[PDB]
Design a protein around this ligand. Structure first.
Ligand SMILES: OCc1ccc(-n2cnc3ccccc32)cc1
Ligand SMILES: [Cl-]
Ligand SMILES: [Cl-]
Ligand SMILES: [Cl-]
Ligand SMILES: [Cl-]
Ligand SMILES: [Cl-]
Length: 345
């Protein structure tokens, strides 16, 4: 067991192992408070996140378990991973606080977004390479957007900030980036959605790297659906059948029919292989979109694609998601996961 030291940073008590030094506040979300630190063990600048009220409700206890399980599983160059997890508690009886340690992220994609076609190839390649790994575990991100992508001076990219089913109605309302990257089936609750929603989000991201503009900057959910359908066309009877909400079906049928536009006349000057890939991602019927594994083999990525270096994940058991438990049962499962953690080589 390491020796812990205590200190108050911006109105909060932090108790951490001696290996973590020179803590300075650097974050203010909802999930927790975040400090930058130097790890004396590895030599890395690191992010230390202290969870707020991790066990205040069944909902919160289960979210805390979910986020730890997910972060302990992800071992990929293009995904956020866990360097350490710790609690100052000596027993389950006194267990209240959970701290997560990752590499310290600087720029997000917004901070770096003038880009060549070669920059767009390499950036979208890394998103698909990390997505193929994510989807192979039967995990759905549900919230890919430029603020959820960390990028360094060398244009190396990692995916972070997995959707933990946290996003709120008020957060999705009006002229907001939080909704611009979402698939229409999940934006308007048309159907049981699946991993294809992430490919729609990657298409909105690639289009914005090519043009420097948001592809669908809607002023509300209805404005955004009108922008989407003017690009990809209105649905035919085959997709209409697959919308379970009678009311969402009737509203769509109220709209005058529109054909799919010519993407060469929308993405003017773009590499033709870039245009062809966008047509394969931005398909209204989710059953018909290109998968991450299929996209990696598209000729657009010819100079980066290496099928011996696009790894898949170990199997990921999510049976806990259908389990009904007490606050103390989730907290007990969380404790075992903290104490069993094994750091990377
Ligand atoms: O909740 C897991 C988790 C998410 C993000 C991070 N994170 C990494 N580098 C950061 C820099 C600034 C703010 C947050 C940062 C750590 C942990
Ligand atoms: Cl230590
Ligand atoms: Cl990492
Ligand atoms: Cl504690
Ligand atoms: Cl964003
Ligand atoms: Cl598992």
């Amino acid at each position: 067991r390491p020796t812990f030291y205590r200190q108050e940073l911006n109105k909060t008590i932090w108790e951490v192992p001696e290996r973590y030094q020179n803590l300075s506040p650097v974050g203010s979300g909802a999930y927790g408070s975040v400090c930058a630190a130097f790890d004396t063990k590895t030599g890395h600048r690191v992010a230390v996140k202290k969870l707020s009220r991790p066990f205040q409700s069944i909902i919160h206890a289960k979210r805390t378990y979910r986020e730890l399980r997910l972060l302990k599983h992800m071992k990929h160059e293009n995904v956020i991973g866990l360097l350490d997890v710790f609690t100052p508690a000596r027993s389950l009886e006194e267990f209240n606080d959970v701290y997560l340690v990752t590499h310290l992220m600087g720029a997000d994609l917004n901070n770096i977004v003038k880009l060549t076609d070669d920059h767009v190839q390499f950036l979208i390649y890394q998103i698909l390479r990390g997505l193929k790994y994510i989807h192979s575990a039967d995990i759905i991100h549900r919230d890919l957007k430029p603020s959820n992508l960390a990028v360094n001076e060398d244009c190396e990219l990692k995916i972070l900030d997995f959707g933990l089913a946290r996003h709120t109605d008020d957060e999705m309302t009006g002229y907001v980036a939080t909704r611009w990257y979402r698939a229409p089936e999940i934006m308007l609750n048309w159907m049981h959605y699946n991993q294809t929603v992430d490919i729609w989000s990657v298409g909105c991201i690639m289009a914005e790297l090519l043009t420097g503009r948001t592809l669908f900057p809607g002023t509300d959910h209805i404005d955004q659906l009108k922008l989407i359908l003017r690009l990809v066309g209105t649905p035919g009877a085959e997709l209409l059948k697959k919308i379970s909400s009678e009311s969402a079906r009737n509203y769509i049928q109220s709209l005058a029919q529109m054909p799919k536009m010519n993407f060469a006349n929308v993405f003017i000057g773009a590499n033709p292989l870039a245009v062809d890939l966008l047509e394969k991602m931005l398909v209204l019927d989710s059953d018909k979109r290109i998968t991450a594994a299929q996209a990696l083999a598209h000729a657009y990525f010819a100079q980066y694609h290496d099928p011996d270096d696009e790894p898949v994940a170990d199997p990921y058991d999510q049976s806990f998601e259908s389990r009904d438990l007490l606050i103390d049962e989730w907290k007990s499962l969380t404790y075992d996961e903290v104490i069993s953690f094994v750091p990377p080589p």
